[PDB]
Each structure stands twice: as C-alpha cells, then as structure tokens.
Amino acid sequence: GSHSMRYFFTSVSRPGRGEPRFIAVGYVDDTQFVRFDSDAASQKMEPRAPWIEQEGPEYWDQETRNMKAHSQTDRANLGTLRGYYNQSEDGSHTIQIMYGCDVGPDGRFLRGYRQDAYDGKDYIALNEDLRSWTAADMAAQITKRKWEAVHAAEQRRVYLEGRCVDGLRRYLENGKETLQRTDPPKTHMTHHPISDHEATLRCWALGFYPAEITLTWQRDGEDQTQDTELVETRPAGDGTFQKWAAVVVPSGEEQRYTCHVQHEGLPKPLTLRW
C-alpha cells in the first residue's frame, strides 16, 4: 500500500510573555522522527528516530532555520489573529498547522495536505486540488484572499510534489528497516463476569504496526455494534500499538460471540472465541 509524511506545528501564546511555546513533531506513517521544542535548551531540530541522524549538518541546520522561521511567523500570526478576532493580550491562544505528503507503492505522488487551525477550530485549509483554499470562518477569508494574491496555492504544490515527497522517499529508503515493517497483532481474549447473568468478553490485540486495525464482535456471524465497547488505539511506547474491543454477554452464550481482527501485517483475518 501507501506511505505518508506529516508534520504537526502547535504554537500557544503565553500571556505576559513574548515568545509563545512552540512544539513541532514530524512523523512518517506512525514513526516519529524529528522534534523541535521552544522550551528545550537544544533550540535545534532534534532527531527522534534511529535512521534520521544519518543526515548531515546540512540537514539539521536547514531544518532548524526552517522552523525557527516557522515559529517566527506564528509569533506574528498569533498577533495578527488577535486583531482579526478583537482579542485581548491576557489570553492564551493556539495555532496549529499540519502539512505533509503521501506517496504510493512505487514512490509515486498521491496526495498533499496543509491545514491551519486557530484554537482547535478549523481556520484555513488547502483543498484536494492543491489549487484552492477553503476558509472555515470569516477571518480566514481575509487571509485566504491575501494568499490568493501571492499564489500560496501553487507554492504549497511545489513543496508537496517536490521536496516533501523526495524526503518521504529518501526516508522510506534510508530507514527502510523501521518504516516498511508490518507487525501482526498479538491477540488474546478476556472473560470478566459482571453479574450472575452477564459477563464481558474483551478482545485484546497488542503489539502491532501500523496502527490501522479492525476489531469486530459478531454474534452467530451477525455483526454486533450494540453491547460493544472499543477504546481508541493506544501507543505502547515502543513504536507499537494496542487496542481492545469488549462485548457484554449473557452467561452460557460465550461460544456464540466471535471477535474478528483485521490487520495489514496479518495474512488472513483472525477469529477468536471463548
């Protein structure tokens, strides 16, 4: 299948302080590989993968400037938006940008992205075309037509289809061992009686990568979206993920409930029963 690269930028205005706190994190698929923290004493884009510090000082130096600068702009932008929204200096507001690119199985270009959000709400975003912007609210339009003047539509496209993809390609090959793995889920089932008449059949799936996973409970081969509970996939802290899906069962009917697990690194879908 495909692969992807995403960078996440967050800037939170500190009331009373100049430089807001800035955090930038870079992922490939589901493996983080770079970090930049305003409050870090490093003040340099640090490595967070095993395969990334094989890039020389030409890389880390440019990457630091690249988001030293990205932070600078957010400083000014946090103030510009403070005017667009008639907001006082005593507040704390967040600006979130996420941009990246998706390659196909043959290194082909598939999709580009850039989305900006002010205070957790959508602000401006780049359309599928990579030729158009869509503004969430009023203010974002006064930014939108400003970007339409400078052809920000195009110039994102020259990053997404140029240097972004060549990076994702160069990363997927340099860290080919870490990034192109598949990790089948290590599964097991749990039986917890709750009443004298009901229990809970929990379906575990630990240690898998990528995080894409499909858990399905089924009664007599019929899908059971009713008494089902599904926690969102949790990171185990070692680059792999966990997820469990439970169902409430009337006693003496556990041999009727079947848990189904689908994963990319799994050859045939799983089936689990008590």
Binding site: E63, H70, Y159
Partner: peptide, 9 residues
C-alpha cells in the same frame, strides 16, 4: 523535510 518559508494571515 519541512517547508522552505511560511505564510502570514
């Protein structure tokens, strides 16, 4: 590789 320059609102 992060983007070369940035946009102001």
């Amino acid at each position: 590789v992060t983007e070369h320059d940035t946009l102001l609102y």
